Amino acid sequence: VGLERDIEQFTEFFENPAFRPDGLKLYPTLVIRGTGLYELWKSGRYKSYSPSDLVELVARILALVPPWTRVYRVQRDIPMPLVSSGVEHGNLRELALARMKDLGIQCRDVRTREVGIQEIHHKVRPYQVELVRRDYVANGGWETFLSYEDPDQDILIGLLRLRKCSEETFRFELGGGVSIVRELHVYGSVVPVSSRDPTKFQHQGFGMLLMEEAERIAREEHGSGKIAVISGVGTRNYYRKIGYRLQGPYMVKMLK
Amino acid sequence: MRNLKLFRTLEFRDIQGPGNPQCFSLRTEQGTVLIGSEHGLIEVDPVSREVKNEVSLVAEGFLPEDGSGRIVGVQDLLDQESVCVATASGDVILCSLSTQQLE
Amino acid sequence: QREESSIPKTCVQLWTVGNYHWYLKQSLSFSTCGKSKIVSLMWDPVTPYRLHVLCQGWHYLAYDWHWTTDRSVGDNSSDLSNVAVIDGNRVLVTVFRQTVVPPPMCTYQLLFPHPVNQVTFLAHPQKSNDLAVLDASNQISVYKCGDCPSADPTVKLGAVGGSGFKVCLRTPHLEKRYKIQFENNEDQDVNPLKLGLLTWIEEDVFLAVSHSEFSPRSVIHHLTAASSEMDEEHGQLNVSSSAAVDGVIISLCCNSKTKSVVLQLADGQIFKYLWESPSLAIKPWKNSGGFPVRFPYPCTQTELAMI
Ligand SMILES: CC(=O)SCCNC(=O)CCNC(=O)[C@H](O)C(C)(C)COP(=O)(O)OP(=O)(O)OC[C@H]1O[C@@H](n2cnc3c(N)ncnc32)[C@H](O)[C@@H]1OP(=O)(O)O
Ligand SMILES: C[C@H]1O[C@@H](n2cnc3c(N)ncnc32)[C@H](O)[C@@H]1O
């Protein structure tokens, strides 16, 4: 895979409906002793990129990520002395961000747009919060992505993901007209349960606003007659508070 | 999404020339078409319904007159005023405009 | 020509791509034997949307396209924001006032026996949800909204259907399949696209623009529906008028509230066309100062507003 197939690879990754994921982990290839790639490298048949080319490629790749995708990590964490060739530095992400600032392009993923990261890396706070909705098609399904965010400063606060079940669902609880919620999240610092902090963002009612809108799309637009949520356990108690009941491993509610 | 809509069409019927057309090429900066045939070259302006030049490649022994021979390719050259035709029998003639010169 | 008596045909198709989905946008038909045979094709190397065609009988053609979106405009209490997209022999309709559907999918779907070339909406303030479709066989189909859908087999549901899903919306139904007759019977032209800028201005009146081939001239037609009585299905659209204009017409626009029709020529001059008058006169368009209006450059999108 040369230097030109990578750009096409990632462009297809983010433009082809069969591939669009929810999160990404970028792991540039490292050659380590005791593997077949090590034998290939010794025989003079495989050579890595130059560091400038690698930084340029990572900047170009990060410029393509859609606003509904979150990047969790950018390189491996193998100690430097054990690597025979490949990446040698330890802060590829910030070097790539500086290069992107030089080129004039910007990164717009989820991680680098939330309140905590924008608060510790820069010094900004939301002022003019608004509601945003994005729809698309992925993996044969109709996906929606609801969010509360500040447009002028590009700051994210809370998000929710919704999907209409396709015609090839096998679970018994989701057959017959069910729409499923896949994630609900509000960022900031941690606020302990039943506590409140007016200088943080969690316990201020951004969650019941995001669920009321999800319950309106699933009834007037999807045409469904039931809504289901996948959740943990504390979330089980939360959704019981909202008005959902338990069925199997899901929290369900009638919409009729 | 969006879709295409046709908003203009231009048609120039009943061009008259030596034989049957075989190839054509465009002159962008001037807005003129170069048509090749079984005898020579024609240069025609479609927005004014007129022919501007004509060069015969049969009188100078480059193409047979019995009815055989083709011009495989006709190409305009920018930064010049000459047209490079290519005979099927195999030759690279470099014709010129504003005159009747060949090379 | 596998059959001994079969008459071969030539087709030129224009395709584009979306979300990795390949649409079929345009289809042109040409003959294969005689003066109409095609010798060569070529895209213009500078202008993106110009096509050059050279036939056998010393014949030359040039075609110009541009991108556009088909949407409906009407009163607040009645109109639903509609968008129509062409996908070959199907038309995909998304109703945006009730459902917001990603582009590859749609609210509902109309099926046709021939590839579609033009799609348009009605220009009535209280009936702006009707549809008209013109396909490659030169017939116009009309789809109207009524209290009873009539359950015609040519209308299907898209992403708002399935087993167990139910949403309340009004779908249209077929009403006529008109046929266009020209002045007597003639070989027409090797050009297969003679009617352009089709505009549905009243529940029985269409306007179309035709281009000449000798002088730089244009013609405006009046397609009106005529029937002795409700004899059967189908119908006949008789060309009932023809107006001549010097210059090349490149855009036609209408206002559904004030009922004004505006023409743009190839140099920039704007004209007003009166169709309800018995004189069918054409006038220049005046500004506040009483002077004629000319666009400095040829615009590709035009609209009429009330400032
Ligand atoms: C279901 C899933 O997949 S996970 C949800 C995301 N996981 C997380 O906990 C990370 C961050 N999550 C959050 O921000 C919240 O826990 C959410 C998303 C569940 C709700 O977000 P918020 O905007 O904070 O909720 P909102 O302000 O509307 O509700 C506050 C109430 O929820 C309660 N609550 C919050 N989390 C929980 C929980 N895990 N269990 C029980 N009650 C909870 C609070 O105690 C408060 O109740 P009270 O003030 O009446 O006593
Ligand atoms: C745990 C993840 O580590 C990544 N991974 C595995 N081997 C290597 C390597 N030599 N270099 C870089 N990344 C690697 C793979 O993507 C695997 O899924």
Cβ contact (<8 Å) for A225 and C164?
A: yes
Query: How far apart are the C-alpha atoms of A164 and A146, rounded to whole Å?
Result: 14
Alpha-carbon distances of A216 from A198, A222, A224, rounded to whole Å:
29, 9, 10
Kindly list the partner chains of chain C, i.e. chains with 3 or more CB atom pairs below 8 Å: A, B
CA distance C143 to C171: 10
Asked if C78 and C39 touch (Cβ cutoff 8 Å), the reply is no
Q: Which of C173, C267, C251, C265 is nearest to C207 (CA)?
A: C251
- Interface probe for B, chosen from C56, C58, C92 (most Cβ of B below 10 Å), is C58
Which CA distances in Å does A117 have to A59, A109, A111, B33? Answer: 19, 12, 7, 61
- Tell me which method was used to determine the 3D structure: cryo-EM
Q: What does the block give as tokens for C151?
A: 């359950």
Instruction: Check if the beta carbon of residue B9 is closer than 8 Å to that of residue B2.
Output: no
Of C201, C199, C198, which is closest to residue C257 (Cα–Cα)?
C201
**Cα–Cα dist C103/B1, whole Å:** 7
Region of residue B14 (left: phi > 0; alpha: psi -120 to 50; beta: else): left
Do residues C165 and A175 touch, judged by C-beta distance below 8 A? no
| Residues of chain C contacting residue B33, judged by C-beta atoms under 8 Å apart | 52, 60
Q: Relative to the CA of A86, which ligand 2 atom is closest?
A: 11
C chain contacts of residue A142, beta-carbon cutoff 8 Å: 101-102, 105, 159
Contact of chains A and B by CB distance (3 or more pairs under 8 angstroms): no
Q: How far apart are CA C244 and CA C209, in angstroms?
A: 10
Are C109 and C172 in contact by the 8 Å Cβ rule? The answer is no
* Chain B residues lying within 8 Å of C266, measured CB to CB: 8
The answer to whether C249 and C237 are in contact (CB under 8 A) is: no
Q: Can you tell me whether residue A149 is helix, strand or coil?
A: strand
Q: How far is the CA of A63 from the centre of ligand 2 (A)?
A: 23
Ligand nearest the Cα atom of residue A75:
2
- The torsion angles phi and psi of C137, rounded to 5 degrees, stand at -100, 10
Backbone angles phi, psi at A56, to 5 degrees: -60, -45
CB atoms within 10 A of CB A255: 18
CB burial of residue A223 (10 Å; 0-12, 13-18, 19+): buried
Nearest residue, CB atoms, B14 vs list C54, C58, C119: C58
Residues within a 6 A CB radius of ligand 2:
A 27, 29-30, 32, 76
